[PDB]
C-alpha cells in the first residue's frame, strides 16, 4: 500500500522552427504516458513476461501540469520560447537558461521541469540525477528531443510512445541503467536487487527469454525495463525495487525531493 | 537516453 506522490510539471517548448513548436495535444499525450507508466496503467503491461509479472511495480506517482507559476501567476503549465540555437548541448545545459537561448527553470524544489528541444545525433533526451540537486539546483529536470516527445502524433518511430521521458524521469528519480554502465561486464550494478544482473544494454525489440553471461538462465535479463535502451513499444515496466528507490526521494523527513509534496496540490489546482 | 540504431541510416550511404 502507498500514498500517491504528486509531481507538478512545467513543459518548456524551445523551438528554432515551426516543426519544433510541438502541439498542446502532443504535450498532453506525454503527461498521459508518464501517468500510465508510473501508475501501472500502461496497456502494454499485457506484454510484460509472466516470469516478471510479480516483480512489476506501481510507482503511484502522478504528474499534473502546473496551474500556478513561480510568480504566483496563472499558467497552463506550458511555456513556448523561440530561439536562434539550432541544436542544444547536454554539456552546456543551454536549453535551461534564457541567456543561452533556452528558458530558465521554474523553482526546481516545487516543479519538475521538462524542456523540449532539438538535441544532437543519437541523443533522445537527458536528465539530472538527485545527487546534483544541492550543487546544481537550476539545471535539475529533464530534456527531451522534440521528435521523441509524446505518443504518436509528431513523435518518430521507433521512439514514438513517450518512453524517452519515462526513462529520463526514472533517472531524475535516482534510477540507473539496468546493465550497470559497465560496457557489458557483470561487475557494475544498478543497485536494484530485483533487476537481474545484466551485461550490456539491449536495443530494438529483443526475444524473450534473453540470457547473457550475467543471468545465464531463463527468465534472463529484463530488457523490457524502462531503464534499458530498447524501443519504446518494447519496454513496459518498472520493478517493485525501482519503485522503492524512486519513492524514497519523497520521504517526508529525509527525501531529497520532499519539498515538492508540500505545495503540489496548490500548484496543480486552477 | 541514446538511440543505439541511429547511425545505421548514416553508415550505409555516402
Ligand atoms: Ca540489478
Ligand atoms: Ca553489466
Ligand atoms: Zn539512461
Author numbering:
A (entry chain A): 58 to 327
B (entry chain B): 1 to 14
What is the paper's account of this structure, in its own sentences?
We next obtained a product complex of mature mirolysin with a tetradecapeptide (Lys1–Lys14) occupying S1′ and further primed sub-sites of the cleft plus a citrate in S1 (CIT−1). However, a tetradecapeptide from the lipoprotein was found covering sub-sites S1′ to S6′ and more of the primed side of the active-site cleft [for sub-site and peptide substrate nomenclature, see Schechter & Berger and Gomis-Rüth, Botelho et al.]. Moreover, a citrate anion was attached to S1 on the non-primed side. Thus, we serendipitously trapped a product complex, which revealed the molecular determinants of substrate binding and catalysis of mirolysin (see Section 3.5). Citrate CIT−1 mimics an amino acid in S1 after catalysis. The side chain of Lys1 intrudes into the S1′ specificity pocket and binds the main-chain carbonyl of Thr287 at the pocket bottom. Lys1 Nζ is linked to Asp289 Oδ1 through an internal solvent-mediated salt bridge, which explains the preference for basic residues in S1′.
Another unicellular pappalysin is the T. forsythia KLIKK MP mirolysin, which protects the bacterium against complement-mediated bactericidal activity. It is secreted as a 66 kDa zymogen (see UniProt code A0A0F7IPS1), which when activated cleaves several physiologically relevant host proteins such as fibronectin; fibrinogen; complement proteins C3, C4 and C5; as well as antimicrobial peptide LL-37. As part of its virulence factor armamentarium, at the site of colonization it secretes mirolysin, a metallopeptidase of the unicellular pappalysin family, as a zymogen that is proteolytically auto-activated extracellularly at the Ser54–Arg55 bond. The catalytic domain conforms to the metzincin clan of metallopeptidases and contains a double calcium site, which acts as a calcium switch for activity.
